[PDB]
Amino acid sequence: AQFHDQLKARLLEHTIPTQILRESTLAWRDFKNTFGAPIRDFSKIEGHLAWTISTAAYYKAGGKPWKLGDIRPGVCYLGLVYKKIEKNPQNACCAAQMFLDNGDGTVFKGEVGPWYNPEKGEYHLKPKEAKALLTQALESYKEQNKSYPKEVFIHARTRFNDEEWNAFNEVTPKNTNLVGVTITKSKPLKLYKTEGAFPIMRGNAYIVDEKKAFLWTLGFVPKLQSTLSMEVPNPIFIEINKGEAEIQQVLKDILALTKLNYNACIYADGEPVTLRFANKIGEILTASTEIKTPPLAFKYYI
Amino acid sequence: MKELIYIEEPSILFAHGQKCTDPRDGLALFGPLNQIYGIKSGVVGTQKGLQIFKSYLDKIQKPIYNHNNITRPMFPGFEAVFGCKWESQNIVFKEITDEEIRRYLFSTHKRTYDLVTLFNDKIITANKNDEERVDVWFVIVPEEIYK
Amino acid sequence: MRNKIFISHATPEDDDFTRWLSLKLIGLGYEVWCDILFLDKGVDFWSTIE
Amino acid sequence: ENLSYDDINIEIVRLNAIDFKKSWAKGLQDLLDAFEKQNVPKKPKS
DNA sequence: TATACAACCTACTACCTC
RNA sequence: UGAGGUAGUAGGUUGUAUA
Ligand SMILES: [Mg+2]
C-alpha cells in the first residue's frame, strides 16, 4: 500500500490523473504458477474486467458515464470518515459532498483540508473545525447554485455529540435544517429464507423504530438472476441520530447514494459511496507529508 | 409478524434523457452523457509493459464475452460503447530500464520511497518538458515491485 | 367560428339525399359544409376535411 | 409526450400506437413482440 | 493508574469470485 | 493496486462499579 498511496499523493501535488495496472491483471495467462495454473483466473470474467477498466479510464479522462436522477433537489449529502495517524496519535477527518441542482446535474466532489483531533480515541470534532467544515460546504453549494441549501443531510459511520451539533447549528443559516444519520454495517441480524435455497432479495427494510431501521443492500437481485454477495447477506443499521426526519426518505437516499460508484462497473455496492470515496481520500492525504490546499476533484484520488 | 417494507431501486440517467437500473445495460444501449473526443494516453514502464498494454488495448477494441451474459453483460467494444477513440497508436512511452529497477530496488521504508520517486519524477518531467498532451498516465507495475 | 353543419355520406351512392339536404338547409338560412357542393378543386383531400 | 392521442391527423388515428414516450427499451421490446407475432422475416449473437 | 464488564471504533492478512 | 464480498486476527475509547 505504500507505493500506490505515495505515488498518488506526490502526483496530487501536481494534479496529474494516473492509473496503476499490474502486469498480471492485463496478461494473466503468462504469469503461470503451481503447475500451469494462473494465480488469478479471468477465464470467465474478462468482459467484466474490460468493463471496469474502460469505465475507470473514461472517467479519469474527463467524461461522465451516467448521472443520478431521483434525488431530492435542494439538499447536500456529506460523508465524514475518520482516519487515525500514529506517526501524536491524531485523528484526521475527510468528507465528500454530493448535491444536485440547476439542470439535474450531479455535483460529486470531496470536501478536503482534513480537520484533526489530538486524542487517542475521540472520533469527534472540536467546534472550530466543525464550523470550518460546514462553512466550506455551504459556501461551495452557494457558489455552485447561487443560493443556500434548503436542508443538509450529514451522515457518517459514527455518532454526533452535542458540541458538534451546537457548532453546526451556530454556523447554519436561518432557513436550513440539519439531519444526522449513522450507518453501522456489522450489527448481527440475519434473515434466512424458509423455503428457497437463494438469499433474501435486495431492497427489504425493517423499521424497528421511528428513528432506527435495517436495510438489505446486498443479496439476490432479480435482473441479474444472481446474488451480490456470498453466504448470507448482511444488513446495515441506519439511525437518525440528531435532527427531525422520516425513516423512509433516509432509506431512499441511502440507496440512491449506493447507486453511483464510478470506480467500478457493478449493479450496486453494499455501502454508500460518499463514505468509501472519503476513506480513499483520507488514505491518500495521510500517506503524504503536508498539503496546503488539496484538489477536490475525484480523478486524482481514485 | 414483523412486516417488512420494500424500497424500489433507483434510476440513473444515461444519454438522451433515458433511465435504467444497471449501468452496464444503459451504457451498452444508450451511451455516456458527455463528448470528450479522445483519450491520449501515456505509459511508464518496461518494454514488456508497453507490449502488454498495447496487446490489451488491441483486445478491448473488439467485442468480448463472458461465460453467462445475464449476470455479467458482454462487452460491445470501446468505440461501440463510449464513442471515444482509445488506441495503441497514440501512446507516449517513458521507458524504465531493467538496470534501473535491478539496482534501485534490491529497510522496506526507503525502497518504496525511491521507486515512487523514480516513477513520479519521470511523470513530472514528461508533463513539464514535453509538447504532447496526455490526459491519463498509466503505470505498468512489474511483478517485482509489488512483492 | 363554429357555425358550419358538417354532413358525411358514402362516395358512390347516398349522394342525392345529401345534395337535397344541403340545398334545403342553405335555403333555410343555415351554413352547411358538404363534399359535393363545397371542397374546391385542387385542394388537399384530407387536411381540409380535418 | 406533449402530443395527446386526440390531436393526431386523420390517417392513423384509428390505429393503436406503440408506446415510446416513457422508455425506449420497452417500446423496442413491444416492436419485436409484434414482429414475431406477425412473422416478419429476419436473418440472424442476436 | 490498573483488574473485570457492556457498547462502539479502526486496522491489517488471507481467501473466494457467483 | 480492475473490482466486490465474506470472514479472521489484533488492539483502543467511553460509562459505571472498585482498589
Ligand atoms: Mg481505481
Coordinates of C-alpha atoms (C1' of nucleotides) and ligand atoms in Angstrom, one line a residue:
Chain A
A1 CA 0.0 0.0 0.0
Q2 CA 3.0 2.4 0.3
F3 CA 3.6 2.5 -3.4
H4 CA 0.1 3.4 -4.5
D5 CA -0.7 6.0 -1.9
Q6 CA 2.6 7.7 -2.0
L7 CA 2.5 7.9 -5.8
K8 CA -1.0 9.3 -5.8
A9 CA -0.2 11.9 -3.1
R10 CA 3.1 13.1 -4.7
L11 CA 1.3 13.5 -8.0
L12 CA -1.7 15.1 -6.3
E13 CA 0.9 17.8 -5.6
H14 CA 1.0 18.4 -9.3
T15 CA -2.6 17.4 -10.3
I16 CA -1.9 14.6 -12.8
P17 CA -4.5 11.9 -13.4
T18 CA -3.0 8.4 -13.3
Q19 CA -3.9 4.7 -13.2
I20 CA -1.8 1.8 -11.9
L21 CA -2.2 -1.5 -13.7
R22 CA -0.2 -4.6 -12.7
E23 CA 1.2 -6.8 -15.4
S24 CA -0.7 -9.8 -14.0
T25 CA -4.1 -8.1 -14.5
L26 CA -3.5 -7.3 -18.1
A27 CA -1.7 -10.6 -19.0
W28 CA -2.9 -13.3 -16.7
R29 CA -2.2 -16.4 -18.8
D30 CA 1.5 -15.7 -18.9
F31 CA 2.2 -15.4 -15.2
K32 CA 1.5 -19.1 -14.5
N33 CA 2.3 -20.7 -11.1
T34 CA 1.9 -24.1 -9.4
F35 CA 1.9 -26.4 -12.4
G36 CA 0.3 -24.3 -15.2
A37 CA -2.5 -22.6 -13.2
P38 CA -2.8 -18.8 -13.4
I39 CA -2.6 -17.1 -10.0
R40 CA -5.8 -15.3 -10.9
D41 CA -8.1 -16.9 -13.5
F42 CA -10.0 -14.3 -15.5
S43 CA -11.2 -17.0 -17.9
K44 CA -14.9 -16.2 -17.4
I45 CA -14.9 -12.5 -16.3
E46 CA -12.8 -11.0 -19.0
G47 CA -15.7 -8.9 -20.2
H48 CA -16.3 -7.6 -16.7
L49 CA -12.6 -6.8 -16.5
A50 CA -12.8 -4.8 -19.7
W51 CA -16.0 -3.1 -18.5
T52 CA -14.3 -1.9 -15.3
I53 CA -11.0 -0.8 -16.8
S54 CA -12.7 1.0 -19.7
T55 CA -15.1 2.8 -17.3
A56 CA -12.3 3.9 -15.0
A57 CA -10.2 5.1 -17.9
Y58 CA -13.2 7.0 -19.4
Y59 CA -14.0 8.7 -16.0
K60 CA -10.4 9.7 -15.3
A61 CA -10.1 11.4 -18.7
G62 CA -12.9 13.8 -18.0
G63 CA -16.2 12.1 -19.0
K64 CA -19.3 11.2 -17.0
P65 CA -20.7 7.7 -17.8
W66 CA -24.0 8.3 -16.1
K67 CA -25.8 10.6 -13.6
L68 CA -28.3 10.3 -10.8
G69 CA -31.9 11.5 -11.5
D70 CA -34.0 10.5 -8.5
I71 CA -32.5 12.6 -5.7
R72 CA -34.3 15.3 -3.6
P73 CA -33.5 18.8 -5.0
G74 CA -32.0 21.3 -2.6
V75 CA -30.1 19.0 -0.1
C76 CA -26.4 18.3 0.5
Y77 CA -25.0 14.9 1.4
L78 CA -21.8 14.9 3.5
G79 CA -19.9 11.7 4.4
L80 CA -17.4 12.0 7.3
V81 CA -14.7 9.4 7.7
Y82 CA -12.1 9.4 10.5
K83 CA -8.6 8.0 9.8
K84 CA -6.1 7.6 12.7
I85 CA -2.5 8.8 12.1
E86 CA 0.0 7.2 14.6
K87 CA 3.2 8.6 13.1
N88 CA 0.8 12.4 18.3
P89 CA -1.9 9.8 17.5
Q90 CA -4.1 12.3 15.8
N91 CA -7.4 11.5 14.1
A92 CA -8.0 13.1 10.7
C93 CA -11.5 13.8 9.2
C94 CA -12.1 14.0 5.5
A95 CA -15.5 14.5 3.8
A96 CA -17.2 14.0 0.5
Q97 CA -20.1 16.1 -0.9
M98 CA -22.9 15.5 -3.3
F99 CA -25.7 17.7 -4.4
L100 CA -27.9 18.2 -7.5
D101 CA -29.3 21.5 -8.7
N102 CA -29.7 23.8 -11.8
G103 CA -30.0 21.3 -14.6
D104 CA -30.4 17.8 -12.9
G105 CA -26.5 17.7 -12.8
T106 CA -25.0 15.7 -10.0
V107 CA -22.0 17.5 -8.4
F108 CA -19.9 14.9 -6.6
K109 CA -16.8 16.3 -5.1
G110 CA -14.8 15.8 -1.9
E111 CA -14.6 18.5 0.8
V112 CA -10.9 18.3 2.0
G113 CA -8.5 20.1 4.2
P114 CA -8.5 17.4 6.9
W115 CA -9.5 18.6 10.3
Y116 CA -7.5 16.9 13.0
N117 CA -8.3 15.9 16.6
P118 CA -5.5 15.1 19.0
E119 CA -6.9 12.3 21.1
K120 CA -6.2 8.6 21.1
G121 CA -9.9 7.8 20.7
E122 CA -12.5 10.6 20.4
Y123 CA -13.7 10.2 16.9
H124 CA -15.2 13.7 17.0
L125 CA -14.5 17.3 16.0
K126 CA -13.9 20.4 18.1
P127 CA -16.2 23.4 17.5
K128 CA -13.7 25.4 15.3
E129 CA -13.1 22.6 12.8
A130 CA -16.8 21.7 12.6
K131 CA -17.6 25.4 11.9
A132 CA -15.0 25.5 9.2
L133 CA -16.3 22.3 7.6
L134 CA -19.9 23.4 7.5
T135 CA -19.0 26.9 6.3
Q136 CA -16.9 25.5 3.4
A137 CA -19.6 23.0 2.4
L138 CA -22.3 25.7 2.4
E139 CA -20.1 28.2 0.5
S140 CA -19.4 25.6 -2.1
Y141 CA -23.1 24.8 -2.6
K142 CA -24.0 28.5 -2.7
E143 CA -21.2 29.2 -5.2
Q144 CA -22.4 26.4 -7.5
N145 CA -26.2 27.0 -7.3
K146 CA -26.3 30.8 -6.4
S147 CA -28.4 30.0 -3.2
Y148 CA -28.1 28.3 0.2
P149 CA -29.4 24.7 0.6
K150 CA -32.9 24.1 2.0
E151 CA -31.5 21.2 4.0
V152 CA -28.3 19.4 4.8
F153 CA -28.0 15.6 5.1
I154 CA -24.9 14.7 7.2
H155 CA -24.1 11.0 7.5
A156 CA -21.2 9.2 9.0
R157 CA -20.1 5.9 10.4
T158 CA -20.0 7.4 13.9
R159 CA -22.4 9.4 16.1
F160 CA -22.5 13.1 16.9
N161 CA -22.2 14.7 20.3
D162 CA -23.9 17.9 21.4
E163 CA -20.8 20.0 20.9
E164 CA -20.6 19.3 17.2
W165 CA -24.3 19.8 16.6
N166 CA -24.3 23.1 18.6
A167 CA -21.4 24.4 16.4
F168 CA -23.2 23.2 13.3
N169 CA -26.4 25.0 14.3
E170 CA -24.3 28.1 15.1
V171 CA -22.9 28.3 11.6
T172 CA -26.2 27.2 9.9
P173 CA -28.2 30.0 8.2
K174 CA -31.7 31.0 9.2
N175 CA -33.7 28.6 6.9
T176 CA -31.5 25.5 6.7
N177 CA -32.2 22.2 8.5
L178 CA -29.7 19.6 9.5
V179 CA -30.2 15.8 9.9
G180 CA -27.7 13.4 11.4
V181 CA -27.6 9.8 10.3
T182 CA -25.3 7.0 11.4
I183 CA -24.7 3.9 9.2
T184 CA -23.4 0.9 11.1
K185 CA -22.5 -2.1 8.9
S186 CA -21.9 -5.0 11.3
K187 CA -24.9 -5.4 13.7
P188 CA -25.8 -9.1 13.9
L189 CA -29.1 -9.6 12.2
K190 CA -29.7 -12.3 9.5
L191 CA -32.9 -13.1 7.8
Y192 CA -32.7 -16.6 6.3
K193 CA -35.4 -17.6 3.8
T194 CA -37.7 -20.5 4.9
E195 CA -38.2 -22.4 1.6
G196 CA -35.9 -21.4 -1.2
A197 CA -32.1 -22.0 -1.4
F198 CA -31.4 -18.4 -2.5
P199 CA -30.9 -15.4 -0.3
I200 CA -33.3 -12.6 0.6
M201 CA -33.9 -10.1 -2.2
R202 CA -32.3 -6.7 -2.0
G203 CA -34.4 -3.6 -1.1
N204 CA -36.1 -5.1 2.0
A205 CA -36.1 -2.8 5.1
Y206 CA -37.2 -3.3 8.7
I207 CA -38.4 -0.3 10.6
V208 CA -37.6 -1.1 14.2
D209 CA -38.4 2.4 15.5
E210 CA -39.4 5.8 14.3
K211 CA -35.7 6.7 14.1
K212 CA -33.9 3.4 13.5
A213 CA -34.1 0.7 10.8
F214 CA -32.3 -2.1 9.0
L215 CA -31.7 -2.2 5.2
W216 CA -30.6 -5.0 3.0
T217 CA -28.2 -3.5 0.4
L218 CA -27.0 -6.9 -0.7
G219 CA -28.5 -10.3 -1.6
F220 CA -30.4 -11.6 -4.7
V221 CA -31.2 -9.0 -7.4
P222 CA -33.9 -10.1 -9.9
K223 CA -32.5 -8.6 -13.0
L224 CA -29.1 -10.3 -12.7
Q225 CA -30.6 -13.6 -11.5
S226 CA -27.8 -13.9 -9.0
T227 CA -26.6 -12.6 -5.6
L228 CA -24.5 -9.5 -4.9
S229 CA -22.8 -11.3 -2.0
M230 CA -21.8 -14.7 -0.7
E231 CA -23.0 -16.9 2.2
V232 CA -25.9 -14.9 3.8
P233 CA -26.3 -11.1 3.1
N234 CA -25.6 -8.7 6.0
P235 CA -27.9 -5.7 6.5
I236 CA -26.7 -2.2 7.6
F237 CA -28.1 -0.3 10.5
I238 CA -29.5 3.2 10.0
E239 CA -30.2 5.7 12.8
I240 CA -31.4 9.3 12.7
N241 CA -29.0 10.4 15.4
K242 CA -29.9 14.1 15.5
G243 CA -32.5 16.2 13.8
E244 CA -36.0 15.6 12.7
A245 CA -36.6 13.4 9.6
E246 CA -38.7 10.5 8.3
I247 CA -37.2 7.0 8.2
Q248 CA -38.3 6.3 4.6
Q249 CA -36.7 9.2 2.8
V250 CA -33.5 8.4 4.6
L251 CA -33.5 4.9 3.3
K252 CA -34.3 6.0 -0.3
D253 CA -31.4 8.5 -0.1
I254 CA -29.1 5.7 1.2
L255 CA -30.0 3.5 -1.8
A256 CA -29.6 6.5 -4.2
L257 CA -26.1 7.1 -2.8
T258 CA -25.2 3.4 -3.1
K259 CA -26.1 3.6 -6.8
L260 CA -23.2 5.7 -8.2
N261 CA -19.8 4.1 -8.0
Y262 CA -17.5 5.4 -10.8
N263 CA -14.5 3.3 -9.7
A264 CA -16.2 0.0 -10.8
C265 CA -18.9 -1.2 -13.1
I266 CA -21.4 -3.1 -10.9
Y267 CA -25.1 -3.1 -10.3
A268 CA -24.6 -1.6 -6.8
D269 CA -22.4 -1.8 -3.7
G270 CA -23.1 -2.6 0.0
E271 CA -22.3 0.8 1.5
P272 CA -23.0 4.4 0.3
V273 CA -20.1 5.6 -1.9
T274 CA -19.8 9.0 -0.2
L275 CA -18.1 7.2 2.7
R276 CA -15.9 4.9 0.6
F277 CA -14.6 7.7 -1.5
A278 CA -13.9 9.8 1.6
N279 CA -12.0 6.9 3.0
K280 CA -9.9 6.7 -0.1
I281 CA -9.2 10.5 0.1
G282 CA -8.2 10.0 3.7
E283 CA -5.7 7.3 3.0
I284 CA -4.2 9.3 0.1
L285 CA -4.0 12.5 2.1
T286 CA -2.5 10.9 5.3
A287 CA 0.1 9.0 3.2
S288 CA 1.8 12.3 2.3
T289 CA 3.7 14.8 4.4
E290 CA 1.7 18.1 4.1
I291 CA -0.6 19.7 1.5
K292 CA -1.7 23.3 1.8
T293 CA -4.8 23.2 -0.4
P294 CA -5.6 19.8 -1.9
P295 CA -7.6 19.3 -5.1
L296 CA -11.3 18.5 -4.7
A297 CA -11.8 16.5 -8.0
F298 CA -12.1 12.7 -7.7
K299 CA -9.9 11.9 -10.7
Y300 CA -6.7 12.5 -8.9
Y301 CA -7.6 10.3 -5.9
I302 CA -9.4 7.2 -7.3
Chain B
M1 CA -45.4 -10.9 12.5
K2 CA -42.9 -8.1 12.0
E3 CA -43.8 -7.0 8.5
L4 CA -41.0 -5.9 6.2
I5 CA -41.2 -2.9 3.9
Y6 CA -39.8 -2.7 0.4
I7 CA -37.9 0.1 -1.2
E8 CA -37.6 0.4 -5.0
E9 CA -34.4 0.6 -7.0
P10 CA -33.1 4.0 -8.0
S11 CA -32.8 5.0 -11.7
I12 CA -29.7 6.6 -13.2
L13 CA -30.0 8.9 -16.2
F14 CA -28.0 7.9 -19.3
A15 CA -27.7 9.7 -22.6
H16 CA -30.8 11.0 -24.4
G17 CA -32.5 11.5 -21.0
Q18 CA -33.1 7.8 -20.7
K19 CA -33.2 5.8 -17.4
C20 CA -32.0 2.3 -16.4
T21 CA -31.0 0.4 -13.3
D22 CA -27.9 -1.4 -14.5
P23 CA -25.0 0.9 -15.6
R24 CA -23.7 -1.8 -18.0
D25 CA -27.0 -2.2 -19.8
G26 CA -27.7 1.5 -20.0
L27 CA -24.1 2.2 -21.3
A28 CA -24.4 -0.6 -23.9
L29 CA -27.8 0.7 -25.1
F30 CA -27.7 4.5 -24.9
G31 CA -24.2 5.6 -24.0
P32 CA -22.3 8.2 -22.0
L33 CA -23.6 11.7 -21.3
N34 CA -20.8 14.0 -22.5
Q35 CA -18.5 14.1 -25.5
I36 CA -14.7 14.0 -25.0
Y37 CA -13.2 13.5 -28.4
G38 CA -10.4 11.1 -27.4
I39 CA -8.1 9.7 -24.7
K40 CA -4.4 10.4 -25.3
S41 CA -2.6 8.0 -23.0
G42 CA 0.9 7.8 -21.6
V43 CA 2.8 4.6 -20.5
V44 CA 5.5 4.4 -17.9
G45 CA 7.2 1.0 -17.5
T46 CA 9.5 -1.6 -19.1
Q47 CA 9.3 -2.5 -22.8
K48 CA 7.3 -5.6 -21.8
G49 CA 4.9 -3.3 -20.1
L50 CA 4.3 -1.4 -23.3
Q51 CA 3.9 -4.6 -25.2
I52 CA 1.3 -5.9 -22.7
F53 CA -0.6 -2.6 -22.6
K54 CA -0.7 -2.5 -26.4
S55 CA -2.0 -6.1 -26.7
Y56 CA -4.7 -5.4 -24.1
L57 CA -5.8 -2.2 -25.9
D58 CA -6.0 -4.2 -29.2
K59 CA -8.1 -6.9 -27.4
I60 CA -10.5 -4.4 -25.9
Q61 CA -11.0 -2.6 -29.2
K62 CA -13.3 -5.5 -30.2
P63 CA -16.2 -7.3 -28.6
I64 CA -15.6 -9.7 -25.7
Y65 CA -18.0 -12.2 -23.9
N66 CA -18.3 -14.0 -20.6
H67 CA -19.5 -17.4 -19.6
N68 CA -23.0 -16.2 -18.9
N69 CA -24.4 -13.0 -20.3
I70 CA -27.3 -12.4 -17.9
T71 CA -25.3 -11.9 -14.7
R72 CA -22.4 -10.2 -16.5
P73 CA -23.3 -8.4 -19.7
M74 CA -20.9 -8.7 -22.6
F75 CA -18.6 -6.0 -23.9
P76 CA -19.6 -4.5 -27.2
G77 CA -16.3 -2.7 -27.6
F78 CA -14.8 0.6 -26.5
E79 CA -15.8 2.7 -29.5
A80 CA -19.2 1.0 -29.7
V81 CA -20.0 1.7 -26.1
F82 CA -18.3 5.1 -25.2
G83 CA -17.9 6.5 -28.7
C84 CA -14.3 7.5 -28.0
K85 CA -11.0 6.6 -29.6
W86 CA -8.5 5.0 -27.3
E87 CA -6.0 3.2 -29.5
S88 CA -2.4 2.0 -29.2
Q89 CA -1.0 4.2 -32.0
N90 CA -1.2 7.4 -29.8
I91 CA 1.0 6.3 -26.9
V92 CA 3.7 8.4 -25.2
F93 CA 6.2 6.0 -23.9
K94 CA 8.6 6.7 -21.0
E95 CA 10.9 3.6 -20.5
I96 CA 12.2 2.4 -17.2
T97 CA 15.3 0.4 -17.8
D98 CA 15.8 -3.0 -16.3
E99 CA 19.1 -2.0 -14.7
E100 CA 17.3 1.0 -13.1
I101 CA 15.0 -1.3 -11.1
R102 CA 17.6 -4.1 -10.6
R103 CA 19.9 -1.6 -8.9
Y104 CA 17.3 0.8 -7.3
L105 CA 15.1 -1.8 -5.6
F106 CA 17.4 -4.6 -4.2
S107 CA 14.8 -1.3 5.1
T108 CA 11.4 -1.5 3.4
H109 CA 10.7 2.2 4.1
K110 CA 13.3 3.8 1.8
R111 CA 12.9 1.5 -1.2
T112 CA 9.1 2.2 -1.5
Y113 CA 10.1 5.9 -1.4
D114 CA 12.8 5.6 -4.0
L115 CA 10.7 3.7 -6.6
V116 CA 7.8 6.2 -6.2
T117 CA 10.4 9.0 -6.6
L118 CA 11.6 7.3 -9.9
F119 CA 8.1 7.0 -11.4
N120 CA 6.9 10.4 -10.2
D121 CA 10.0 12.3 -11.4
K122 CA 9.6 10.6 -14.9
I123 CA 5.9 11.6 -15.0
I124 CA 6.6 15.2 -13.9
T125 CA 9.5 15.8 -16.3
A126 CA 7.3 14.4 -19.1
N127 CA 4.4 16.7 -18.1
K128 CA 6.6 19.9 -17.9
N129 CA 9.3 19.2 -20.6
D130 CA 7.2 18.0 -23.5
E131 CA 4.8 19.4 -26.1
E132 CA 2.5 16.4 -26.4
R133 CA -0.8 16.2 -24.5
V134 CA -1.5 13.3 -22.1
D135 CA -4.8 13.1 -20.2
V136 CA -4.3 9.9 -18.2
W137 CA -1.0 8.4 -17.3
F138 CA -0.7 4.6 -17.0
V139 CA 1.9 3.0 -14.7
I140 CA 2.5 -0.7 -15.6
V141 CA 4.0 -2.0 -12.4
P142 CA 6.3 -5.0 -12.9
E143 CA 6.0 -8.3 -11.0
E144 CA 8.9 -7.5 -8.6
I145 CA 7.7 -4.0 -7.4
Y146 CA 4.7 -5.5 -5.5
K147 CA 6.3 -8.5 -3.7
Chain C
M1 CA -66.4 30.2 -36.0
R2 CA -68.5 27.1 -35.0
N3 CA -71.3 27.7 -37.4
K4 CA -71.0 25.1 -40.2
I5 CA -73.1 21.9 -40.2
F6 CA -70.9 19.1 -41.4
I7 CA -72.6 16.3 -43.4
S8 CA -70.9 13.0 -44.2
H9 CA -72.1 10.3 -46.7
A10 CA -70.8 7.5 -48.9
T11 CA -68.9 8.1 -52.1
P12 CA -70.7 6.2 -54.9
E13 CA -74.3 6.3 -53.5
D14 CA -76.1 8.2 -50.8
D15 CA -75.3 11.4 -52.7
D16 CA -78.7 12.6 -53.9
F17 CA -80.1 12.7 -50.4
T18 CA -77.0 14.7 -49.2
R19 CA -77.5 17.2 -52.1
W20 CA -81.2 17.6 -51.3
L21 CA -80.5 18.1 -47.6
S22 CA -77.7 20.6 -48.2
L23 CA -79.8 22.6 -50.7
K24 CA -82.8 22.7 -48.3
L25 CA -80.6 23.7 -45.3
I26 CA -78.9 26.5 -47.2
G27 CA -82.3 27.7 -48.4
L28 CA -83.4 27.8 -44.8
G29 CA -80.5 30.2 -43.9
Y30 CA -78.1 27.9 -42.2
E31 CA -74.5 27.2 -43.2
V32 CA -73.6 23.7 -44.5
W33 CA -70.3 22.2 -45.5
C34 CA -70.5 19.3 -47.8
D35 CA -68.1 17.3 -50.0
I36 CA -70.5 17.6 -53.0
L37 CA -71.0 21.3 -53.4
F38 CA -68.0 22.7 -51.4
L39 CA -64.4 21.4 -51.3
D40 CA -63.0 23.3 -54.3
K41 CA -60.8 21.5 -56.7
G42 CA -57.0 21.2 -56.4
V43 CA -57.2 21.2 -52.6
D44 CA -55.6 18.6 -50.3
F45 CA -58.1 15.8 -49.8
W46 CA -58.0 15.2 -46.0
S47 CA -56.3 18.2 -44.4
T48 CA -59.2 20.5 -45.2
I49 CA -61.7 17.9 -44.0
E50 CA -59.9 17.6 -40.7
Chain D
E1 CA -45.2 13.3 -24.5
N2 CA -46.6 16.7 -25.4
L3 CA -48.8 15.4 -28.3
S4 CA -52.1 13.9 -27.0
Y5 CA -53.8 10.9 -28.6
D6 CA -56.7 13.3 -29.5
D7 CA -54.7 15.6 -31.8
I8 CA -53.5 13.2 -34.5
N9 CA -54.1 13.8 -38.2
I10 CA -56.8 11.7 -39.7
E11 CA -54.9 8.9 -41.4
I12 CA -53.6 6.7 -38.5
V13 CA -56.0 7.9 -35.8
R14 CA -57.8 4.5 -35.9
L15 CA -54.6 2.5 -35.3
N16 CA -53.1 1.8 -31.9
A17 CA -49.6 3.2 -31.5
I18 CA -46.6 1.7 -29.8
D19 CA -45.6 3.3 -26.5
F20 CA -42.2 5.1 -26.9
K21 CA -42.9 8.2 -24.7
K22 CA -41.7 6.7 -21.4
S23 CA -38.9 4.1 -22.0
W24 CA -37.3 3.3 -25.4
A25 CA -36.4 -0.2 -24.4
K26 CA -40.0 -1.2 -23.6
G27 CA -41.2 0.3 -26.9
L28 CA -38.5 -1.6 -28.8
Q29 CA -39.5 -4.8 -27.0
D30 CA -43.1 -4.3 -28.0
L31 CA -41.9 -3.8 -31.6
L32 CA -40.1 -7.1 -31.5
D33 CA -43.1 -8.9 -29.9
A34 CA -45.3 -7.6 -32.6
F35 CA -42.8 -8.5 -35.3
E36 CA -42.6 -12.1 -34.0
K37 CA -46.4 -12.2 -33.8
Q38 CA -46.8 -11.2 -37.5
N39 CA -44.0 -13.4 -38.8
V40 CA -41.8 -10.6 -40.1
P41 CA -38.8 -12.3 -41.6
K42 CA -35.3 -11.8 -40.2
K43 CA -31.9 -13.2 -41.0
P44 CA -29.6 -13.8 -38.0
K45 CA -25.2 -13.2 -31.2
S46 CA -28.6 -11.5 -31.7
Chain E
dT1 C1' -3.4 4.2 37.3
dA2 C1' -5.0 -0.6 36.7
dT3 C1' -8.2 -5.7 37.0
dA4 C1' -13.2 -7.2 35.4
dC5 C1' -17.6 -5.9 32.3
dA6 C1' -21.1 -3.8 28.1
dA7 C1' -21.2 -0.6 23.9
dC8 C1' -18.7 1.5 19.9
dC9 C1' -14.4 2.4 16.7
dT10 C1' -10.2 1.3 13.5
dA11 C1' -6.6 -1.6 11.1
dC12 C1' -4.2 -5.5 9.0
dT13 C1' -3.8 -10.6 6.3
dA14 C1' -6.0 -14.3 3.7
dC15 C1' -9.4 -16.4 0.6
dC16 C1' -13.3 -16.7 -2.9
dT17 C1' -15.4 -14.8 -7.4
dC18 C1' -21.3 -16.2 -8.1
Chain F
rU1 C1' -3.3 -1.7 -6.9
rG2 C1' -9.6 -3.8 -12.4
rA3 C1' -13.2 -4.6 -8.5
rG4 C1' -16.7 -6.8 -4.9
rG5 C1' -17.6 -9.7 -0.7
rU6 C1' -17.2 -12.8 3.2
rA7 C1' -14.6 -13.9 7.5
rG8 C1' -10.4 -14.0 10.9
rU9 C1' -6.9 -11.8 14.0
rA10 C1' -5.4 -7.7 17.0
rG11 C1' -5.9 -3.6 19.7
rG12 C1' -8.3 1.1 21.6
rU13 C1' -12.1 4.8 23.7
rU14 C1' -16.5 5.8 26.8
rG15 C1' -19.7 4.6 31.0
rU16 C1' -20.4 2.9 35.7
rA17 C1' -18.5 -0.2 40.0
rU18 C1' -13.7 -1.0 42.6
rA19 C1' -9.0 -0.6 44.9
Ligands
MG1 MG -9.5 2.7 -9.3

